Write an enzyme that holds these catalytic residues in place. Sequence first.
Site, PDB file in Angstrom:
ATOM      1  N   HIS A  25     -85.454  45.325   9.655  1.00  0.00           N
ATOM      2  CA  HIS A  25     -85.439  44.743  10.988  1.00  0.00           C
ATOM      3  C   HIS A  25     -86.791  44.361  11.535  1.00  0.00           C
ATOM      4  CE1 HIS A  25     -82.303  43.854  13.925  1.00  0.00           C
ATOM      5  NE2 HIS A  25     -82.436  44.890  14.666  1.00  0.00           N
ATOM      6  N   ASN A  73     -83.606  45.395  20.984  1.00  0.00           N
ATOM      7  CA  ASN A  73     -82.619  44.888  21.907  1.00  0.00           C
ATOM      8  C   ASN A  73     -83.136  44.630  23.307  1.00  0.00           C
ATOM      9  OD1 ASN A  73     -82.519  47.363  23.076  1.00  0.00           O
ATOM     10  ND2 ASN A  73     -80.480  47.817  22.389  1.00  0.00           N
ATOM     11  N   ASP A  98     -85.647  38.869  11.071  1.00  0.00           N
ATOM     12  CA  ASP A  98     -84.751  39.167   9.959  1.00  0.00           C
ATOM     13  C   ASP A  98     -83.412  38.460  10.139  1.00  0.00           C
ATOM     14  OD1 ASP A  98     -84.679  41.172  12.179  1.00  0.00           O
ATOM     15  OD2 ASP A  98     -83.026  42.113  11.044  1.00  0.00           O
ATOM     16  N   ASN A 119     -79.622  41.224  17.708  1.00  0.00           N
ATOM     17  CA  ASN A 119     -79.730  41.767  19.046  1.00  0.00           C
ATOM     18  C   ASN A 119     -81.078  41.526  19.728  1.00  0.00           C
ATOM     19  OD1 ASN A 119     -77.004  42.479  19.420  1.00  0.00           O
ATOM     20  ND2 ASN A 119     -77.357  44.262  18.160  1.00  0.00           N
TER      21      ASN A 119
END
Length: 196
Positions: A25, A73, A98, A119
């Site tokens: 991520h 997020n 990513d 997100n």
Amino acid sequence: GSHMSNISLIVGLGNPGSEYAQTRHNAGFWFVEQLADKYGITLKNDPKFHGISGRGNIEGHDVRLLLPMTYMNRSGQSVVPFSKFYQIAPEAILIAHDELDMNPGVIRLKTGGGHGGHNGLRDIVPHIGPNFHRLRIGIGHPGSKERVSGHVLGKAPSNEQSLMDGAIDHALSKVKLLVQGQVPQAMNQINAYKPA
Ligand SMILES: Nc1ccn([C@@H]2O[C@H](CO)[C@@H](O)[C@@H]2O)c(=O)n1
């Protein structure tokens, strides 16, 4: 502010902390950190915009780099105020992230579209709209939706890491086109990358 579709803000998405630094991520962090090193842009603490940021010359153009330190997020809580303060329009922004829907070793430059379930992007598009550029760094998908956190928060095996690293290296070599506004050519040349 920004000027046309010369890219003048490059954002890398990721999570803060050593525990996340090697996880899939954080692919966008990898790219921006490597880019900063290539061009000698200092990434310094930027508490006002909840991130780490820098400014310097890439190929004769003044460019700003940003790594939100918000957790993924909440990335928009960095990117939106930063871009607004510096008067950078979406069309001058590249966001590296990513991409679950692409293989390790695949990389694509995309303009527009939605968040694709990412997100970090989900926190940004509502504010600035979709018309920013994305460097989609393939990371693969765990198969099931219940596995996505374990995949993105995982450390890739060495073969997949090598394939991502080669793709990122390729993209670094194409940032010159982007900061010059040669988005079509950059797209062609980034999207044509193959690992082997
Ligand atoms: N101490 C470290 C070690 C690694 N990394 C990043 O993780 C990726 C996978 O090891 C590497 O490709 C990338 O550098 C990091 O950011 N900080």
